[PDB]
Symmetry: C2
Subunit: 602 residues, 2 copies
């Protein structure tokens, strides 16, 4: 009688309606799993609580990847962004990453609409306080209303809410976010099963009133024209560029002054709070600040670079010492949030818990910070939760093929000491894992899982085919050029390696060029970088070998000859899925890898 009815039983239960939860719930539901997404306040689904932006150095590529796998974040920002630009634009297209300013309000509504109308997905406003487990297998969930719902798998994405404490000056206020409640009960479930629990703390700037800011002397920071898109599926379909002339808004730049730093001092690894970095870098005389609009209708301005947790009275003084903000009025005070986190090392690269079958974690609760890093994990967790529910085998993303894979690999293999951010990761395949080819690297898996339709993948296969045609064509079409006082014969493909664009080649030599925007650009990029991709691949050949060497899930590390005791210990807890992953465990020696390889018969 405390048990919900048949009509209230699910395959997958996602705890959380944030960035991880949304991708997870949408992925599972779209794969056919009857999914329930629990949320503390149904009106906050999809809410952006920090920076009003999507994308960035590594973040932007992850979004592109989420979009390729069949997720929503990419489509959401394309439809609700108010500014788009490319970062690292002076060093070749391969190192670039897209970034956009979002209209927070429109973004939230967009995600709520897609979620509400998603077939097989049900939203439940209720606080989950416990997970029901039978023989290390997830079988249900309980809320603080004394009810229980049956489920086959659970994806936890409590974000910054679990036992959240808001910090402002010496005031401590319970909550998952400023002005919102926090969750509590679920933490007892984790202690009860002996899961390690740690607390992370991150801050956010105050929210400023646009009418009280003098922008007159500030430098304008505009978008790009034509602006890049995050989704391969939005209009223009099969392309990553918006039409030239798309309507965009501005951002403004200002800086801290020595007076700002003195105010902070009087009131006293990657610590972003202005207060922290003036102590970490006592010598920098000024710190850059980006004033960002929060939407087209709102007057709130997000001052990027001024996150703090100082008392509100001090916030007034420090914010008003910044040129342009002399008379600024705060709408929302800056603050810092501390919450519960379960160390990622408790998971396999499938995001599934080692202790309990059918339990997956994602987002800030998993030790990361950021919308994108959360959404990237969420889609994987959602995918695997559905698979589990269907009695199939969970998958994982190889770090040598996607940035989502790199992130997940570092979390579950290295663990975290502080919140993980995508820009701290080091991809050994940075030339292959680019912004322009997420679609080519992940679309197959996306279609395989059923997230992409037959039609979506058909477009991908076609373009991929067109691309290969032209590459083989330009590689067979030679041309004679006068290099100084001597004459040479080079193929068009090779000319791309010598500062020629396809447009240059057509203009000077009259050759033809792909008419499809994507094929046209992707061909140029692949030919220009072929030399480096091949060299990069050559250098990591040994990493590739290890990565392709699977380790039995039923492997008894105690029966392996030539493996130290301290090694069996680590290999016993991390439980690597491949020898390549096993070699990344901090502390394992090249010898151990050998013993293991020998034992595996290689």
């Amino acid at each position: 009688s405390h048990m919900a009815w048949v009509v209230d039983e699910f395959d997958v239960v996602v705890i959380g309606g944030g960035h991880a939860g949304i991708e997870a719930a949408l992925a599972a539901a779209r794969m056919g799993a009857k999914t329930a997404m629990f949320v503390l306040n149904a009106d906050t689904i999809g809410q952006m609580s920090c920076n009003p932006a999507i994308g960035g150095i590594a973040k932007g590529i992850v979004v592109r990847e989420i979009d390729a796998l069949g997720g929503e974040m990419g489509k959401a920002i394309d439809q609700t962004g108010i500014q788009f630009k490319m970062l690292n634009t002076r060093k070749g297209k391969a190192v670039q990453s897209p970034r956009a300013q979002a209209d927070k309000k429109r973004y939230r509504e967009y995600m709520k609409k897609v979620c509400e109308n998603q077939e097989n997905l049900y939203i439940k406003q209720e606080e989950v306080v416990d997970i029901i487990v039978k023989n290390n297998q997830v079988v249900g969930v309980r809320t603080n209303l004394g009810v229980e719902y049956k489920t086959k798998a659970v994806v936890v994405t409590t974000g910054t809410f679990l036992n959240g404490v808001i910090y402002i000056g010496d005031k401590m206020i319970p909550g998952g976010r400023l002005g919102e409640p926090r969750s509590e009960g679920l933490s007892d479930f984790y202690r009860r099963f002996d899961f390690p629990l740690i607390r992370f703390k991150t801050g956010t700037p105050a929210r400023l009133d646009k009418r009280t800011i003098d922008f007159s002397a500030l430098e304008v920071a505009p978008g790009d024209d034509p602006p890049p898109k995050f989704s391969f599926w939005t209009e223009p379909v099969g392309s990553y560029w918006f039409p030239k002339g798309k309507e965009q808004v501005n951002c403004w730049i200002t800086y801290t002054t020595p007076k700002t730093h003195e105010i902070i001092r009087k009131n006293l690894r990657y610590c972003p709070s202005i207060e922290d970095k003036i102590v970490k870098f006592p010598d920098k005389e000024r710190h850059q600040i980006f004033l960002e609009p929060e939407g087209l209708d709102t007057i709130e301005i997000y001052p990027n670079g001024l996150s703090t947790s100082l008392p509100e009275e001090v916030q007034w003084e420090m914010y008003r010492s910044i040129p342009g903000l002399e008379n600024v009025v705060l709408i929302r005070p800056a603050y810092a949030i501390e919450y519960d986190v379960v160390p990622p090392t408790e998971l396999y690269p499938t995001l599934e818990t080692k202790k309990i079958r059918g339990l997956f974690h994602a987002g800030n609760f998993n030790g990361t910070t950021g919308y994108e890093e959360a959404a990237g994990q969420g889609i994987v967790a959602g995918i695997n939760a559905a698979l589990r529910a269907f009695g199939k085998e969970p998958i994982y993303l190889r770090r040598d093929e996607s940035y989502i894979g790199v992130m997940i690999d570092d979390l579950t293999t290295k663990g975290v000491t502080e919140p993980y951010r995508l820009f701290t990761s080091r991809s050994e395949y940075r030339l292959y894992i680019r912004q322009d080819n997420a679609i080519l690297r992940l679309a197959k898996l996306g279609r395989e899982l059923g997230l992409l339709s037959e039609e979506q993948y058909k477009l991908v296969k076609e373009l991929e085919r067109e691309i290969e045609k032209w590459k083989e064509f330009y590689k067979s079409e030679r041309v004679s050029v006068a290099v100084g006082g001597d004459t040479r014969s080079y193929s068009v493909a090779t000319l791309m390696t010598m500062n020629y664009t396809l447009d240059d080649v057509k203009e000077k030599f009259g050759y033809e060029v792909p008419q499809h925007p994507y094929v046209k650009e992707e061909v140029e990029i692949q030919l220009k970088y072929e030399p480096y991709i091949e060299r990069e691949r050559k250098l990591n050949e040994k990493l590739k070998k290890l990565e392709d060497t699977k380790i039995p899930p039923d492997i008894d590390y105690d029966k392996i000859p030539g493996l130290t005791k301290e090694a069996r210990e680590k290999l016993k807890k991390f439980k690597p899925i491949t020898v390549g992953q096993a070699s990344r465990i901090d502390g394992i020696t090249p010898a151990a890898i050998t013993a293991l390889l020998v034992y595996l018969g290689k």
Copy 2:
């Protein structure tokens, strides 16, 4: 150092971004007062937490009045409403009242957008935990972040938040609303100043998934065509009707069954007037076999359905059972459970009809915190409190709305003169001038005050005056144009105006007698309504002549009731506590005897 800077000093501080707070903050700001609107979550400004509707029996007229005074509610629902209709459409236009279904989401956004861009208005996301007083005069406000802001007046509209507790079965959860935090500290200020504090409790239904409901056999409930508008200012300007063909959505009807009722009885335990919770009205009306239920959409993008008539605070597992016993909902899935909220309330008897506190000058109260419940009742008080707060800030005298001229005035009068033992609702009030205070003439009754305060622009009022003049020209025209009619086998000479009381409409008079009619939509309809009801309005006015007499008799603010001869001791105790501003209001205090009123009239030299 804990004190906010000069740039953070205000004339008026409104605590709350709800329905009372929005009208109060916008009114004061539009009147020129530097205004700060505090709220717990800036993203919840203008949020509708209960029924997704605006209007109804008395509520609809109050919206028309808010709009006539220069408020926003009217404009808001007109731009975000997805269904509009008139109630009591078979009993003459005088007893009709507008009602609309709102797209909750669009409505919230609309209010947030207007408030954010309103000049002189500043939004502050922060919890006010104390009000600073100097010689019984509001001087500032303090928040839970240890900071203070200077202000000259404060409007408190905590709604259902102050020490709010959510109820579901046996569970008690702190919160101002399901999924939202509650406020607490401010209650200390009131105990500290010895204010009386009571707790009211109201419930709301669950939110249902539209795709799990079978509407196949349910009665459809559409809007009207043409649909009525709430604002006189939205397009078509200077009119109360939308064009024919406006796109609207439907609502659906269902009923409870005997099985539904038996489900509630098995799960009800004993515990020590208007109790809308289905579970209460079946114990209060044991003989009713079925209860009507209106299934209404909450917006165009959302799949959430609001089951009007099924508010409850029963355990969630019991809710599943009762909701599923209702035809069409056999397999319904809840998105949000039903619950009841209990919050702090300061008895309205602590205020003058101006909504200002008798104990502290510059302090005003409005909305649920004031003892009422409903969006419209809150916004009605809000605009008044906002207006008076700004006036106070400027050193001018606060105003009040006479109950014989507006329904808002009726509400405020009843609240401050009768007090409340339960949440006050607009349909329970009784206007002795129900024929004068109509839905069609709110604009004619309140536009002058609206313009006088600065809420309406010169151009807005100019329109009202022009129409007001055309209306009068037409009435005098139809009053001098006689026609001949055959009352049986007899011939009579009647003025066109008289025919309006003999079942003739202006359209009938033109079609049959060929007379001209007004071309402006409002003039054309108001002339007809005014002529048709002139007889009753005059009779109503004659029957209340005495009431008008008493209401026009002002009572000095500093009268010493102890010095009035011929006044009982129990009568002086009521007069000293309620402190009526007119003899009319005084005669409305429960217990006051006709003799006591005479002694007072004599004392005032009458």
